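Subject: complex prediction, re-run

Hi both,

The earlier run crashed halfway through, so I resubmitted it with identical inputs.
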Amino acid sequence: TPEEKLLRAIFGEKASDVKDSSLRVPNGVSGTVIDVQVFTRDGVEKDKRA
Amino acid sequence: TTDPVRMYMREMGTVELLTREGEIDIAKRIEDGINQVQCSVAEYPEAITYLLEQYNRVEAEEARLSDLITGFVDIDPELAREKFAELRAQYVVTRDTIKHATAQEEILKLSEVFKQFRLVPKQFDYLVNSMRVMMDRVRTQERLIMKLCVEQCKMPKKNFITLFTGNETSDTWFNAAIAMNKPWSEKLHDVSEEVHRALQKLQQIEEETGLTIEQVKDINRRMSIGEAKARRAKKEMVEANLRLVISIAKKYTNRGLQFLDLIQEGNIGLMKAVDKFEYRRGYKFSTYATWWIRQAITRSIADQARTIRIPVHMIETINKLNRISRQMLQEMGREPTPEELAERMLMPEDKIRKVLKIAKEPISMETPIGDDEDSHLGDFIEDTTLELPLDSATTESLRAATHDVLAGLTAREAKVLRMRFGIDMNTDYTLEEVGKQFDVTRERIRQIEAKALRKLRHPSRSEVLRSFLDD
DNA sequence: GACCTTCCCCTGATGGGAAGGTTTATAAT
DNA sequence: AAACCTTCCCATCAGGGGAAGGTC
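This time it finished cleanly. Structure:
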């Protein structure tokens, strides 16, 4: 909306073209990570942690 | 029973089958009817004038040679040059000799060379429609000239047919009924303009179709009989071999398509295979009809199966990929590798993954979710369109914050900001757009904007707005 | 200073390609 | 399912022109 465009012009805060997915812990329970697995599709090169 | 599949499954047990006799017996009837309708065109000068225009344009790069003729009853490209001047042996012997006594027994030999050129059905149907339009044109004038005298002047129909039957060309019949002194005679001078000029579109046809108004009726009079014969034969043909369509259609059970849909889409191909079949070749009809039936079922499936329609080609390719993966289960032991079918197929490698990625089917929203409860898939479906109210409140708050802040600046900067941005206004404006009605243009506004955005960049006047940014 | 060679933007061509359409002949109920 | 073929829509390539740059 134009009101937001005025903000983007005032404080120079450009908007990202990306949304957010972010697997975040379910609210109500708090624990410790004990296992992390990574399954990458064939072909697509693996990342660092992979 | 009730189901409408029973009405059909026992609607074919009436017309007995036809083998070895039926086929060749009624195919001759089909051809004997089309022969009656074919010679109806043999005497139609408009057909000659229309054939010349579409003939000379073939040598001028518009229409293909094999696109206007299926052959001659008389694949040889040399059989053409020998039948384009030998048929004119009667062309100019009856046309310019009307100057019409001996031009009555020399019309058959001119039309005989017109039944040795099999035209493609595409133009043949245009010819049939040409005779139909000519009949309707001629007839419009009769249904005009009739109701202008009977329904208006109150004359007996018989006194109309008696004076009209035989002439149908000139006005020698109309102006002759004026001396009858009958009660309708005194009412013939008023309609002397809707009947006299009516022949301008009727009599003129004679000089176009080179034939009397009455002969134009004779031709179609017999042509209708011929086409009726053809219809009455082909319906019986398809009724007889109907069971074959079901025999073929029962090979597609779970094809995303009901049974009757398949048998019907196959009956369509049955009709198509009938219309383009010649009993002369000897080859039985069961061999030929099967091709069109089975194809009109397969392609139909490819068109009505998926809720998301897919071009035919893709269906073929996907089914081939499935086949290769099938015939290799026993080879690899379990199943082939992803990049294996890339070589076994003619297509390249990377297209496999996309072709398989789009091959998904939609799941009915009514598919019961786990726990087997009445809960369905359509109950867990969210709505990611409506923005949550927690943001709508922020919008209604920023509106007021920006309003107060902008009302804190100068008047010029205020309107300039509400202009360059679509603030409380329909459709923001560009640079010279603002300068158009602000009396100084092209850089005035470029300075005003920066000055105002800087007077707001400064704190003590941005805290309110600055809080709205959180990153 | 012209003359020749050079550097960029519209017309319209026209190569490539996805999407469709028409036939297919042993018989086949 | 394969085989040959027409229409349309693509996102791109020789070719033209309006000037443009640089020198015997």
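The longest strand of chain B covers residues 69-71.

- K.
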